[model samples]
Target: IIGGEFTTIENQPWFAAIYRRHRGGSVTYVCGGSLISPCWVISATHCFIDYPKKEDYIVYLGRSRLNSNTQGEMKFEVENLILHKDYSADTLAHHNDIALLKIRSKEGRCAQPSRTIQTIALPSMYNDPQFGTSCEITGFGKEQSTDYLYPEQLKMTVVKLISHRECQQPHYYGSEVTTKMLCAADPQWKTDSCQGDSGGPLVCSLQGRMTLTGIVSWGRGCALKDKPGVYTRVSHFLPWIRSHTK
Candidate 1:
């Protein structure tokens, strides 16, 4: 959420807050996610690499504020975690940064949709957005690289898709930007994603709907000049998602 501004839950109902339990019976916010189905959430594979146990995770929905007992908020226990086999942690390349979480309510049922709790549509099978097209990223990540703080409320910022060539230049992430990834940046380098925002949604308007296009994967120093945020290209993984969620 570096350089991002506060946004309401109604604006991004599909956003999810991922948490893991720490010592002494407390949980910590770790990453963000997008609810793609009643019982399925899409997130970055890296988030689960260290905390691999599904029993240690929880998914919070219908809430804008963190660590609060906000009315209408619902919590679910994770049933399973599915990380992409191609994901590599050593390189941090995030080649296949996406993962899926199967969650269920206390009663062991799927989530029910509401105004502040809904699923976001995945990219169409044949949809490909143009370069420089406008998109939005939402999360509760650090406000800046130098700060250790994160927003209590969800935040969002608009960024434009950058050409793959521009993102592959030596000054940027270079060869790390592969066909499985997409890049977006603010011209001023003032708006982008950062720590604690991983696994969140990179949404864009397509066919008059807010569609999920990418998963918050990684970046260099959070909005640094010429370093755009790289994400797991959702379009490239549609088949993978369909295979797993089915």
Candidate 2:
């Protein structure tokens, strides 16, 4: 992401690097996810909907770099992909963009937390973050919207949450920003999430706990004058999420 700093998996253990396998046998990083439970990961439905088969994707926990294998990294296969019933990629707004992935080992064992891997708390519905509050975003996304290349290591930056009214301004996202989503951006719009950052975590500290408040969903561009990054409001899907995690 633009204007972001390198961060370690030890500091942000919940981050998952999801990759798509190609017919040529090469895998490229696709999106980011957060481990919410031993067998569950939270990511955007739009990231997985494009791929038809379950074997076409993989999830790597505790990974710090994308180009090389790390000592703390552990890769897992997909057990099942559960998309929100209402989430659809057909529209520009991408309503109900949230999803859950039940991850498993080759032999079907569930994930176990390590020093370099753990779960992040899902947000509480009652506690909504106020406007302009800073939430941290981590990803291996593009440095700029114009750049096609993605970064090798994980990077992070803090973005201030924008009000619903401001995000839907005529020059802004307009009607695309909905109650199921939230918008955030840096004050100067220099530090923001880009394409490869989709489905990553946008966590805010709620009542002393770092809560998974947002899921990197979509936006107009990287960092623009009135265009802030749009994310799936995690709290809105707590019911659907518990159906599997429980």
Candidate 3:
């Protein structure tokens, strides 16, 4: 989790919940997830499977802070988790890098509007990303590193949506980067998403409401120079995502 304290309601106002599996005695490995619907959570493809087609997971909702002693107020048994068919972690083939956790339980808090915790609409159009387009990201990862990361704290960060050309500069991620496979977000500011932040939503406003523009895919360190974290462009997977969520 991020190092900063996100206790104030004003901080991480959109954050839905934090999930930690009760394994052994150690309660590490808190994965950040966003509430899409009462019974659905949007997360990363990697979080669901170690290899492939493995939906080994449990999910929690409607709480910001974690006590570690309690599982919060709402708990849902996962019925099924659908990961992108083509996801290859070794190569980091982040295309279709999304996962949907269908829970056995349902509560309507997520479907309602005006709730700080709500599902963001997906973008309908696939427009070319402009240089320095600008984007915002939030997560509960290593806020600041001194080898100790806050386990379940929340943090928000704003990034510049940079161009493909600028991202492909020498020594940068290089041509392995693609216009379709990824979209650029500059996390040059100290605020950034790290390991636990993967799978959280990168929100962008559209038509007076915010839409999910990027999925927290991967990032190097917490907002390091020249290595701005990369995210799965929400526009690219609109068609595939709609077919399922609809």
Candidate 4:
């Protein structure tokens, strides 16, 4: 979330916080997710590296600020985890980088929506926005690469979608950028997604609605020259999202 401005959950209700529990009785935010349905959340598959136990992960919704469990926030324990079978970690290309988490309350019910919490709309597989389209990305990621300065509140930045051909050029990410992935960034590389922003949503305006277009996947580094932020193109996996959430 570097070079972004602070925003409230009202402005990005679909934003979700994915937390990892520690053996020492503490929980920390590790990734971001989007609430597509009451019981379903979408995130990056790369977020899970060690095959974490279901109990080790929790999903928090309806909060803009981090480092607090204050009232008005909704939290749920993950009931099931589904990762794309094709996802590979060796190259970390993150082609099929999307994943879904089924969440539930102790009483076995889905989340209840409120002013600060709601679901985001997913784009149709057939709808791909033109290159240079404007979109917004939100997260609680660090503000810089080395300061370890993760924001206390949610932040957002505006970026333009880059063309597949440009992203595939050897001068940029090279052949690593695949059809299942898309790239976006500020031309100056001043404002962009960084560490801790993975699994976050890239919301693009389509037919007057903010649609989930991408999922933060990977990049050479945080906002580096000629290297834009890469994401798992959501439209390419609509079938996978539908089948698993069924």
Candidate 5:
């Protein structure tokens, strides 16, 4: 809805999708992530904290949507969760808010011998001043989710980049905003990330494939009027991501 006609799942693809459950599987959770390496997934740290064991989280791939018209699709249970050591939930500080999860086992999800899951490369390094670079935000989040859990289909929103200064409009996140953070797409637009979108990649394309530049951290509301959505700049946390991943 946010990217105009470009906002459909086909435009923003995923190798694997994550689901978290509460009440012993009676409930459903939604979050988006990208396959960064053969065995690891880069997701928002907040989504995995409650179910950090990896066994509690599920990953689905090889499909654009969560629910399928066909009989099958692939899903995986996580083996380990690597959360940012400095991540702080209280102030949402550190917004270094990134995490890595190891894939334990696979269920229905499968990749063709010719088309192994393509990964969205991570920047070996990052720079803050170059923040307004355009990217796409993908997630299971719907235009709106009454229960806070995104429905089983992927959605994308396109946005222009917003400099850290413009994003620092105190009028937005107040004094809590920090320079270490990278701002994007002014998400103040009509069709932007809503609840349940946390942790999905803010991706930019180079050559042809998408490369992750940021992680959806938090926003005040569903496409709020003046608030620009905040994301953790991947470049800033490269050391942590690289260290734990290797």
Candidate 6:
């Protein structure tokens, strides 16, 4: 979010701030999630390592600012927490780094579609964006890596897609990169990881609609050369998602 400016939910309604309540009873923002459907949200499995209690997870849709009385913001309780069974966080490859959250209201109502809260479109079965494609990433996480400073407002930035071969190069992520992972840079590497919340979506324009393609995962450092942000490729998990969500 370094090179990007502040944005509103109107620009990215599907963006979600997945909050976690600490043992001290104070709520805090953790990773990011995207509203894939009325009942399903997409996030990263690595984000829920320390979050054991399902009741502690909270989802807020249609809000650009955190803990503020923004109109049209919908707060809901999470019902189902589905982490990838094959996700190996200890491994460097980080295969299957994705999770799904099924949410419902206090009255057990699924998310209601509206202008402020809508589901983001998914990419075709196996349509992957090629290298050099300009995709937009959105988040409300810390603005930088130097200090723990969060803008509290959503930001959007453009990152060019990088190929798996280049991402596995010695100077880049090396052999740690996997096919289920994707790499993207700010073209100048100014817009880096940590700037975007983990599990946030890396969306590319499919025809004229923005489609979710990547889930923010990890990187070496912020704004460093050859250290493009790594993400869980959504195209590779379409079948896995269908088998569960159905």
**Which digits, one per residue and each the tens of the lDDT, describe model 4 over residues 1-246?**
779799988889989999999898688888999999999999988887565577889899997888876367888999988888898764647768888999998779888998888999999886878999989999998888776667898999998999999999998988789888989988898888988999999999998888999998888778778889999999999999999988
Which residue segments of model 1 deviate by more than 4 Å? Answer: 90-92
Model 1 lDDT per residue over 141-207, tens place: 9988888777788899998999888999988887888988999999899899999889998999998
Cα lDDT of model 3 by residue, 131-244, tens digit: 566666776666665546554545666666767787677555666556654444444445566777788777766666666777787655555666656777767876666666
Q: Candidate 2 on 151-244: residue-level lDDT in tens?
A: 8889999999999999999898888888889999988998999898988999999889999999999987788878899999999888888886
Query: Which run of 10 residues does model 3 get worst, by summed lDDT?
Result: 108-117
If both were scored by lDDT, which would come out higher, candidate 3 or candidate 4? 4
Off by over 4 Å in 6: 90-93
On a 0 to 100 scale, what is the lDDT of residue 110 in model 2?
75
The runs of at least 3 residues in candidate 5 whose Cα sits more than 4 Å from the true structure, single-residue gaps closed, are: 1-10, 69-72, 91-94, 106-116, 128-132, 145-149, 186-188, 206-209
Candidate 2 TM-score, C-alpha based: 0.96
lDDT of 4: 0.88
RMSD of each: 1.2, 1.2, 3.7, 1.2, 3.4, 1.4
Candidate 3 vs candidate 5: the TM-score winner is 5
Report the CA-based lDDT of candidate 1 relative to the real structure: 0.89
Model 5, residue 11: C-alpha shift (Å): 3.8
Estimate the TM-score of every prediction. Answer: 0.97, 0.96, 0.79, 0.96, 0.82, 0.95
Colliding residue pairs in candidate 6: none
